[PDB]
Amino acid sequence: APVRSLNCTLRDSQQKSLVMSGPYELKALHLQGQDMEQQVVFSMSFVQGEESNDKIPVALGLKEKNLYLSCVLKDDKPTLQLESVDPKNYPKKKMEKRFVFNKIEINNKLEFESAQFPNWYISTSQAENMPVFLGGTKGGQDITDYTMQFVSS
Numbered sequence: 001a002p003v004r005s006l007n008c009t010l011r012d013s014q015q016k017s018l019v020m021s022g023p024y025e026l027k028a029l030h031l032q033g034q035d036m037e038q039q040v041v042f043s044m045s046f047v048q049g050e051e052s053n054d055k056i057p058v059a060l061g062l063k064e065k066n067l068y069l070s071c072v073l074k075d076d077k078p079t080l081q082l083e084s085v086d087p088k089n090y091p092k093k094k095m096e097k098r099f100v101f102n103k104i105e106i107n108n109k110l111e112f113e114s115a116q117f118p119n120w121y122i123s124t125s126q127a128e129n130m131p132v133f134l135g136g137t138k139g140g141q142d143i144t145d146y147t148m149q150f151v152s153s
Contacts, residue, residue: 120136
């Protein structure tokens with residue numbers, strides 16, 4: 001397909017799942033059993049960009065929703081947000097830079113670095129029910145690695 005994609009769910013290294021907070025925000029929390037279905041299913045697209053054997057550029061949209069994770073400057077600081085796009089023009093192989101993340105395979109975990117803002121990663125808090133955000137520090141209080149689960153689509 002023009003732009004190739006695959007559906008998946010993500011879980012941080014503390015086993016927290018991701019769910020929709022409001023219409024433009026994601027939160028991470030320890031979920032299990034029935035509630036497991038509240039988790040967001042992503043449609044990961046493999047877009048164009050500087051590629052490596054361990055660094056792959058991708059775009060993360062919500063399955064069947066014209067909503068994508070985006071990195072923009074908000075109050076002079078790199079910020080993560082859910083952005084609405086024209087449902088007829090997306091996804092596409094050449095996504096605007098703000099939508100691009102470098103999928104990095106480390107241990108057996110994954111890290112998602114903003115292509116727009118080098119060394120800024122999709123992060124979650126240790127605390128329960130907090131927003132998913134863009135953090136500029138690795139190996140610290142905040143979590144920056146995940147495992148990925150594939151879904152039948």
